[PDB]
């Protein structure tokens, strides 16, 4: 574990996100990401807005903190989903669920530093749709994100909060769009 207040922190965050998710994502997304983070570093070049990259980094130093603290409020909610025949019931499954939270909070952090949800148009909902494919429809997948955005939106301020909110309801909107119309 690591932590710090630089850009070169965040920048490092991305590179491992990319690096431990370029075959799920796949290369699309991958290049997609690696123009992001060029962009991004060219941007910062000529100066970077101090209160999204604090926010962004805050939500990366505590990163494991939110995925701990959401993953314990989902199965507390939904126990189903670690009991015998659950979908995280599998020690395997259990961590592949605490690692694509982190990495739904690794997408935020790029739309709250870019100001912008295009990281999750893009990656976003296409790994929504692969993770539905080799899933299904799980009910109790909903609360799944709302957790994590209260796991995270818990470790800031209203103006924080409401500048981090709207990427959660998008995530939140786009997965419930997926489970309901996955079959059709
Ligand atoms: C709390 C709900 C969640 C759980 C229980 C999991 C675990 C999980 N991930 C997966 C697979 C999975 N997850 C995800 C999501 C993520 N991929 C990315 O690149 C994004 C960064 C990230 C979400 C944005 C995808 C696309 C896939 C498809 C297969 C793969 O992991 O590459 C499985 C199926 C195991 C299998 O049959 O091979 C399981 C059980 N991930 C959750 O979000
Ligand atoms: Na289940
Ligand atoms: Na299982």
Redesign the pocket.
């Known amino acids: 574990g690591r932590g710090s207040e630089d850009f070169q922190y965040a920048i490092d965050m991305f590179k491992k996100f990319i690096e431990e998710?370029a075959?799920?994502?796949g290369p699309e997304?991958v290049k997609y990401a690696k123009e992001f983070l060029k962009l991004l570093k060219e941007y910062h070049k000529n100066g970077i807005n101090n209160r999204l990259l604090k926010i962004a980094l805050l939500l990366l130093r505590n990163q494991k903190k939110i995925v701990d603290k959401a993953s314990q409020d989902?199965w507390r909610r939904h126990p189903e989903?670690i009991a015998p025949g659950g979908?995280?019931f599998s020690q395997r499954?259990?961590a592949?669920?605490l690692?694509?939270?982190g990495?739904?909070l690794?997408?935020i952090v790029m739309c709250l530093v870019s100001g912008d949800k295009g990281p999750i148009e893009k990656?976003?909902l296409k790994?929504?749709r692969?993770?539905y494919?080799?899933?299904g429809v799980v009910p109790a997948?909903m609360e799944?994100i709302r957790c994590l955005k209260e796991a995270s939106l818990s470790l800031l301020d209203e103006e924080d909060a409401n500048e981090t909110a709207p990427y959660f309801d998008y995530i939140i909107k786009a997965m419930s769009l997926e489970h309901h119309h996955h079959h059709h």
């Open positions: 998710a075959a799920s994502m997304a989902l989903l979908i995280a499954d259990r592949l669920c690692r694509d939270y990495w739904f690794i997408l990656i976003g790994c929504i692969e993770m494919n080799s899933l997948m799944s």
